[PDB]
């Protein structure tokens, strides 16, 4: 129930809305971290530790989105990306994160850090996934995201539950 949850949105900026990334990390209702390009406690310490790995990941995901070949939503335009990081996953043997990708409500895939495995919702999702799947830097960022702040995170999740 009370785990670390991070929500990332990556979209094209407009003159009306100049936001192209936003990150919220939550432990239950309490907001650990809120980041965006527009602006921006054991909880303050976790938030501080996650700040850089989050910024750099968001920048990196936009790079990936910009250079990648997505045609669905009828190639409506620049794709919209939602990412959900959950730690710890319920079905893990050892505590590990999952990373859930939604591109434009068309493509859905998930990375399981425990066994470095990827899974998609469907065939067309698998194509995109497998192209991301071999961006080594990407994979390593995802894999070593939680390990960077592990102690601060685990300790905080332990104090919640009290």
């Amino acid at each position: 129930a009370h785990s670390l949850r991070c929500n990332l949105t990556i979209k094209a900026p407009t003159p009306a809305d100049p936001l192209w990334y936003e990150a919220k990390c939550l432990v239950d209702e309490i907001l650990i971290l809120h980041l965006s390009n527009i602006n921006k406690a054991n909880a303050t310490e976790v938030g501080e530790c996650l700040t850089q790995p989050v910024n750099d990941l968001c920048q990196k995901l936009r790079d990936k989105v910009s250079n990648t070949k997505v045609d669905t939503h009828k190639t409506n335009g620049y794709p919209h990306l939602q990412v959900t990081m959950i730690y710890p996953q319920s079905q893990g043997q050892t505590p590990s994160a999952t990373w859930e990708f939604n591109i434009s409500d068309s493509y859905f895939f998930t990375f399981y850090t425990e066994n470095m495995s990827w899974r998609s919702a469907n065939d067309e999702s698998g194509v995109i996934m497998n192209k991301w799947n071999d961006d080594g830097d990407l994979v390593q960022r995802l894999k070593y995201f939680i390990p960077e702040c592990r102690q601060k995170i685990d300790e905080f999740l332990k104090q919640s539950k009290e």
Partner: protein, 264 residues
């Protein structure tokens, strides 16, 4: 302790000759810039986060950084006009000025979304190296012309003063650089088979961390508030193929390197 750190020094390398300062400006959003300066073999010596946070070292007087501050003030204006007049959407962009002070010479790089679009050398023209992914309405001509960058006169008209100030900062770095003053640590996570190696230091050099046998690791650097730096790397055992003997090698452009590993 539990780990042993062996330090290898052959000949100290003086990295302060042919001084070359890189001024980087990254526009992230409306009035949101990250500015940074570094030397050719250094990590960032001066940095302004988009949050407004100013990161520097205690031996620097930031108030004395009038010219560079003025340069970055110019980049903020310049990049704002460029974005509004040409792109019209506030997509992120980076400008990189790599400058030699004596003899004065700049190279200007422009990047969007991990891609280098233009290289401006004053001898050559603007060389176009790439195009930005979602820019059908924007002309190559316009991108190239903005690839010239702005504000270089602030740097040129003050070259001798900048050469002096940055040579002084470089020499201070060389002077403080002592592998024995840094703190080294290892962590093993038994649950997931990861090992991290960490070096904390107050000396902003472009350190390289890698593993002795060549196996890839994930590495990065972090800069904090008080002149504090962190070099960190991650190993996944089982990239070692059953083995359990490894060493992290941390190397400094000044010519020393340290091995960090576990023993008995």
């Amino acid at each position: 302790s539990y780990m042993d750190v062996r330090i290898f020094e052959d000949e100290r390398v003086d990295i302060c000759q042919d001084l070359t300062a890189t001024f980087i400006s990254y526009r992230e959003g409306p009035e949101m810039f990250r500015h940074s300066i570094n030397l050719e073999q250094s990590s960032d010596i001066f940095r302004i986060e988009a949050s407004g946070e100013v990161k520097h070292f205690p031996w620097m007087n930031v108030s004395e950084l009038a010219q560079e501050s003025a340069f970055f003030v110019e980049q903020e204006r310049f990049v704002y006009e460029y974005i509004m007049n040409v792109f019209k959407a506030g997509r992120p962009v980076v400008f990189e000025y790599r400058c030699k002070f004596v003899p004065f010479e700049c190279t200007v790089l422009q990047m969007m979304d991990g891609n280098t679009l233009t290289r401006y050398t004053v001898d050559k023209g603007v060389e176009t190296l790439g195009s930005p992914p979602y820019s059908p309405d924007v002309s190559e001509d316009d991108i190239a012309r903005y690839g010239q960058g702005s504000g270089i006169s602030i740097l040129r008209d003050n070259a001798a003063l900048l050469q002096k100030r940055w040579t002084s900062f470089c020499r201070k770095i060389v002077a403080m650089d002592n592998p024995r003053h840094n703190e080294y640590s290892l962590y093993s996570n038994r649950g997931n088979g990861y090992v991290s190696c960490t070096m904390r230091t107050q000396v902003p050099l472009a350190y390289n961390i890698s593993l002795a046998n060549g196996v890839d690791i994930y590495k990065y650097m972090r800069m904090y508030s008080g002149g504090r730096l962190k070099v960190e790397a991650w190993l996944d055992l089982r990239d070692l193929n059953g083995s359990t003997d490894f060493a992290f090698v941390i190397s400094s452009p000044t010519g020393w390197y340290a091995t960090v590993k576990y023993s008995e």
